[PDB]
Design a protein around this ligand. Structure first.
Ligand SMILES: [Mg+2]
Ligand SMILES: [Mg+2]
Ligand SMILES: [Mg+2]
Ligand SMILES: [Mg+2]
Ligand SMILES: [Mg+2]
Ligand SMILES: [Mg+2]
Ligand SMILES: [Mg+2]
Ligand SMILES: [Mg+2]
Ligand SMILES: [Mg+2]
Ligand SMILES: [Mg+2]
Ligand SMILES: [Mg+2]
Lengths: 152, 397, 127, 61, 150
RNA sequence: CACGUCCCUCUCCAAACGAGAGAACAUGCAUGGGCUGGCAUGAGCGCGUGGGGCCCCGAGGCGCUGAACCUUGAGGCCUCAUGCUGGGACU
RNA sequence: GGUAUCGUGAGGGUAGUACGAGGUACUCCCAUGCCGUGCCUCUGGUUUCUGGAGUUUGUCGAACGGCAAGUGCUCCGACGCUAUCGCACGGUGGUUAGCCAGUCCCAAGACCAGAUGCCCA
RNA sequence: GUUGGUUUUACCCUACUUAGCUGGAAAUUGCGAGAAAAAAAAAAUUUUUUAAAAUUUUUUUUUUUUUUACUUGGUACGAAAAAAA
RNA sequence: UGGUUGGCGUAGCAAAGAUCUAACGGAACGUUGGAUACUGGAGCGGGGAAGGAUUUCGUGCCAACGGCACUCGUACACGAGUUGU
């Protein structure tokens, strides 16, 4: 299961989505933004990044990705606005505020403590390239898991 | 073999790090002179042309009217707001310090902000309350002692008065601040000009005068990531060329085994700083309200205005003092262009020439504009249906 | 002064001249310092090495000189008056610049007539 | 201010371009035109009389 | 509510300097004065909320400026994206709605034939909580028309 | 948390994108007007090849009519007139 | 320590060139070419303001108004962009034409204890 | 001798060309400390002037608000009152 | 031989002109109306051969596939369906 056990089981909510069918590299970016954030400011960052009001700071999986001015917030020039990945993150954060609520915990004091998008087993599909070749297409679905303690 | 395409001393061709066109070097100080300011920020308006009688022994045009293009540069008075002294050092000039004016126009303090109106607007607030106190008056007094002592260079920190520019298109309300060197006499003389002039306006007509030249410096008009054909002037390749025409076909050789800094490459063209020399001042022009018959020369008496009929395109009326100087000026319309006293010898037979304008042009820029005057256009068409549908309404009232 | 170049080598300007030359074929422009690919270009007042391409055979196959006296390529006076011609024709002339015709046909340009004292006289008009 | 050969528009010192036809008038070797519209309108050999914005039109009316 | 109170002191920041300046100008030919032409001292926006969250503005939209040099076969679709962007600024609504009256008009000259102007009859409605319905207001001429909020 | 910067938003002298310049309730934006230009005399009704039985049909023409329309929009002018008017991030 | 502003200028780049005429055989003039740096008043070019007009076939029952012809086509056409196709400009000092310095261009990784504004929980 | 006879790939690294971001002076560390700084203050090296009297109170000066000269709308000096040093 | 990798969220997914709107649906692209175009009878029309062999049809479905998406599909599942003197 979780790479890191929550410090205080009763005070934290865990959530996860295995074989999430969003790009790993985009979801890798999208979930890492959240890793220290309070859940409401993380619900927010996504609602705002879903509006093209703010960007997810792509960091590791930059590549020749385009420069944006909304990335200044994050300390670098490159940034990006996944939607499929931002929605899955909200949809996994709903999962935990639900998990957090049942524990009697208060979702709006709750803080993201551990986000970890592992890359999942990949799905094959086929190209059909120039001179009779057939190279791979492969989605790179991510395993995202997280928990969110609220402070004591 | 043919000459090289482009001047390598204008390089890198990168975006200027400013836009205000600050003077790079002031003309060398001459003690024999009385003290004066050496530059003046002005806003490019647009161009026109003028007729003039060249009276230049030699040439086929002496005694003959010639149509020179002119740039009009609206020039609201700059305000001095502080003095600055430089002391020479073995490592190079160091500011001794600056004495700020007791008061600063908001347009100036706007300059220290990205969002003045959502700011606490505290700029020069401690100075204002401290320059008042005798403690801060003695401190200001000591700075001037340091100027009169350790300085080699006195410089006013002047700024543009955009409030007074009233241009509807020059959107800035931050003032265009800039040090303006005082070449002149002894440092006490320069301090004295500097401090008497330490909160006063400074019209161009004091700094400049007609027929004298001015060096201009303004960032040139921006063209973005220009290609090599437009950037350097290289020949484009023959149609049959494959990868593309608009390229330098050979950006290097085997050795040196890398592109040299001298081969032309696509990138920023325009919006480079430039100091262009020897621009004759065909007329200083007083503000339209003060001296309404601008562009009314001795030989063209109709009361008139330096601004064309449609206004300057993209700029509008020149509501202020204007410098009118021969030829092009670098930069787009409504850019702020610093223009200094000439650094060239200016003893040329041409440069010294007095320029008596025979006809400022005032036709519309926009279309061809065959009328010099809004009155004259009406004097052509006479009344027409807009008036009859107007005149009739007035009679009914 | 400056006269925007009008008649590059290879051009066939007409002979305005009295002579039996019917038209000139500019071969090169006298006084042409050359940049690399640039073609030499005669403009108004310019002397020009030209072979008559049509007209009396006696003129037909030797290089000749000819000043350009008019020009479709418009140019700007220092007076600010851009101006141009219906046609661009020259007149045959000696290396000295004395013209070999006895009387020019149409109008001669002002800066043809001013460079060439003899051309100016035979010119029916100056423009 | 020479006025245009066709439209009779006033043509000020920086404006318009002159044109010298081979078939010159002697009296008027150079024919000023204020605008390309005036010149093309002349190459059509339109008389200025029937084109309404020209002065020779307005004058007869 | 410190900002609302602070903004009132900020209004006085002008009214303090403005009041003093008007008297001096009264003490002292086309020069600008308080009574010359509008009021010299006051800011542009000094003349001026929560308007009823249910109105029916009617304003001309000058499309041709808004479509100049657009790709021809994209004109109509963006004439329609812009008429929404135009109206979202007024109604402050994320949910505008272009009724058949206005879609057909933007389109009745085909994609690229989009009319130079349009007199929309926009209307915010309560209930995407607030939504706007953007009607056409057919008219013989746009001259001398002006926006008419109601 | 201060000052403030930034984003969102608006403008463009900037601009591939970043950056830039500016704005920050501001004639800012919006329409409208006036202007400067463009084109070139709108719709509509009210001399004429002949033709059909005093009118009708008639290209074209005339008159109202330098009219009609267009005129800032990748971004003409005028304050001329009316209209509409902060949130987030960060330390 | 932030933020902001004005500057410093080590270092690096670096460019003006040629011809002709005049004047008197240097100086001094005056044009031009080339180069270079711009600019767009004018002039030319450019039009997807498809601006305005005309016009062809199809089409909307017709006039009007359009519309389709991948911008139908022709004329004029502003803004803008641009042309040696327009226009403006191209400066010194010191050392042995060179060369170096300057002017000119980038300029603090040249880490500027240069100045300066504001706040420093 | 003659005639006809596929000209492939940069999206890598560097060079270069523009374009950004951010660190950094034990060049990221040490607290390892070097300034082209100054060595009671200012004005005309020496002399004179700048809180006083018993922490608090009083007096003076400067700035802000209210009732002529600067390009001419908005800032300065005018006055008078209040606050701060 | 299997798996994995950098390049890389990159190169691209730019041939055939095009969608817009409202309502509804839906957990969120379809459906209908309108608008707008296109094909333009040697047709993205209506039938056949070869070939294919269930693709047909309805309901459902949308896990996978339909190189974006799908609420839709030639996909998936279930049930149907082809009639001759
Ligand atoms: Mg790329
Ligand atoms: Mg990129
Ligand atoms: Mg194959
Ligand atoms: Mg080829
Ligand atoms: Mg113009
Ligand atoms: Mg605008
Ligand atoms: Mg350190
Ligand atoms: Mg890509
Ligand atoms: Mg069709
Ligand atoms: Mg089926
Ligand atoms: Mg199946």
């Amino acid at each position: 299961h979780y790479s890191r056990k929550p410090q205080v089981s009763s005070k934290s909510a865990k959530a996860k989505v295995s074989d999430l069918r969003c790009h790993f590299k985009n979801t890798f970016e999208t979930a890492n933004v959240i890793n220290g954030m309070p859940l409401r400011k993380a619900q927010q960052l996504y609602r705002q990044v879903l509006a093209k009001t703010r960007c997810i700071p792509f960091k590791r999986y930059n590549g020749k990705i385009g420069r944006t001015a909304q990335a200044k917030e994050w300390g670098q020039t490159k940034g990006r606005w996944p939607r499929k990945s931002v929605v899955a993150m909200l949809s996994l954060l709903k999962n935990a505020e639900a998990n957090a609520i049942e524990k009697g915990l208060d979702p709006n004091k709750m803080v993201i403590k551990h986000v970890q998008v592992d890359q999942a087993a990949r799905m094959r599909r086929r190209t059909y390239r120039a001179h009779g070749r057939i190279t791979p297409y492969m989605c790179s679905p991510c395993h995202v898991q997280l928990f969110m303690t609220q402070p004591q | 073999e043919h000459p090289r395409h482009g001047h390598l001393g204008f390089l890198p061709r990168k975006r200027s790090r400013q836009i205000r066109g600050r003077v790079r070097s002031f003309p060398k100080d001459d003690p024999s002179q009385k003290p004066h300011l050496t530059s003046f920020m002005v806003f490019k308006a647009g161009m026109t042309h003028i007729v003039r009688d060249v009276d230049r022994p030699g040439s086929k045009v002496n005694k003959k009217e010639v149509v020179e293009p002119v740039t009009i540069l609206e020039a609201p008075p700059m305000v001095v707001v502080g003095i600055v002294g430089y002391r020479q050092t073995p490592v190079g000039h160091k500011t001794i310090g600056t004495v700020w004016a007791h008061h600063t126009s908001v347009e100036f303090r706007r300059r220290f902000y990205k969002n003045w109106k959502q700011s606490a607007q505290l700029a020069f607030t401690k100075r204002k309350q401290f320059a008042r106190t005798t403690e801060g008056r003695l401190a200001e007094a000591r700075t001037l002692k340091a100027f009169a002592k350790k300085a080699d260079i006195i410089r006013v920190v002047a700024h543009t008065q955009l409030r007074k520019l009233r241009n509807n298109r020059v959107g800035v309300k931050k003032a265009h601040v800039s040090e303006i060197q005082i070449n002149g006499g002894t440092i006490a003389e320069k301090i004295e000009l500097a401090k008497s002039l330490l909160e006063k306006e400074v019209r161009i007509d004091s700094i400049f005068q007609q027929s004298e030249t001015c060096d201009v410096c303004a960032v040139t008009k921006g063209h973005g990531f220009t290609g090599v054909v437009k950037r350097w002037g290289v020949a484009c390749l023959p149609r049959k060329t494959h990868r593309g025409l608009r390229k330098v076909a050979c950006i290097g050789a085997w050795h040196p085994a890398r592109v040299m800094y001298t081969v032309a490459r696509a990138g920023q063209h325009g919006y480079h700083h430039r100091t262009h020399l020897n621009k004759k001042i065909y007329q200083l022009g007083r503000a339209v309200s003060m001296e309404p018959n601008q562009a009314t020369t001795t030989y063209d008496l109709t009361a008139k205005s330096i601004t064309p009929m449609g206004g300057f395109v993209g700029y509008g009326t020149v509501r202020n003092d204007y410098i009118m100087l021969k030829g092009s000026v670098a930069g787009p319309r409504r850019r702020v262009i610093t223009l200094r006293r000439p650094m060239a010898p200016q003893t040329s037979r041409k440069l010294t020439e007095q320029i008596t304008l025979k006809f400022i042009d005032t036709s519309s820029k926009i279309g061809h504009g065959r009328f010099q005057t809004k009155k004259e256009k009406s004097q052509w068409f006479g009344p027409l249906k807009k008036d009859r549908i107007r005149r009739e309404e007035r009679l009914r009232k | 002064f400056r006269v925007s170049l009008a008649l590059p080598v290879g051009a066939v300007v007409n002979c305005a001249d009295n002579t039996g030359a019917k038209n000139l074929y500019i071969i090169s422009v006298k006084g042409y310092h050359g940049r690399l690919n640039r073609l030499p270009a005669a403009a108004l007042g310019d002397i020009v090495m030209a072979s008559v391409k049509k007209g009396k055979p006696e003129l037909r196959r030797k290089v000749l000189n000819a000043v350009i006296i008019r020009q479709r390529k418009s140019w700007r006076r220092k007076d600010g008056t851009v101006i141009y011609f219906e046609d661009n024709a020259g007149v045959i002339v000696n290396p000295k610049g004395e013209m070999k015709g006895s009387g020019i046909a149409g109008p001669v340009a002002k800066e043809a007539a001013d460079l060439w004292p003899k051309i100016s006289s035979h010119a029916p008009a100056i423009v | 201010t020479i006025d245009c050969e066709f439209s009779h528009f006033a043509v000020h010192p920086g404006h318009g371009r002159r044109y010298v036809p081979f078939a010159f008038l002697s009296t008027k070797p150079v024919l000023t035109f204020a605008r390309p519209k005036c010149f093309a309108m002349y190459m059509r050999k339109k008389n200025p009389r029937f084109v309404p914005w020209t002065r020779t039109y307005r004058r007869i009316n | 509510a410190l900002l609302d109170a602070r903004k009132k002191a900020i209004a006085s920041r002008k009214a303090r300097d403005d009041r003093r300046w008007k008297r001096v100008l009264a003490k002292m030919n086309t020069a600008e004065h308080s009574r010359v032409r509008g009021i010299t001292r006051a800011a542009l926006r000094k003349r001026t909320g929560r308007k009823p969250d249910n109105i029916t503005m009617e304003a001309t939209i000058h499309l041709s400026k808004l479509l100049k040099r657009k790709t021809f076969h994209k004109r109509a679709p963006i004439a329609i994206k812009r008429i929404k962007a135009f109206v979202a600024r007024l109604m402050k609504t994320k949910d505008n709605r272009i009724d058949a009256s206005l879609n057909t008009y933007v389109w009745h000259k085909g994609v690229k034939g989009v009319p130079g102007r349009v007199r929309v009859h926009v209307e915010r409605k309560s209930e995407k909580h607030f939504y706007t319905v953007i009607s056409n207001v057919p008219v013989a001429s746009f001259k001398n028309l002006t926006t008419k909020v109601t």
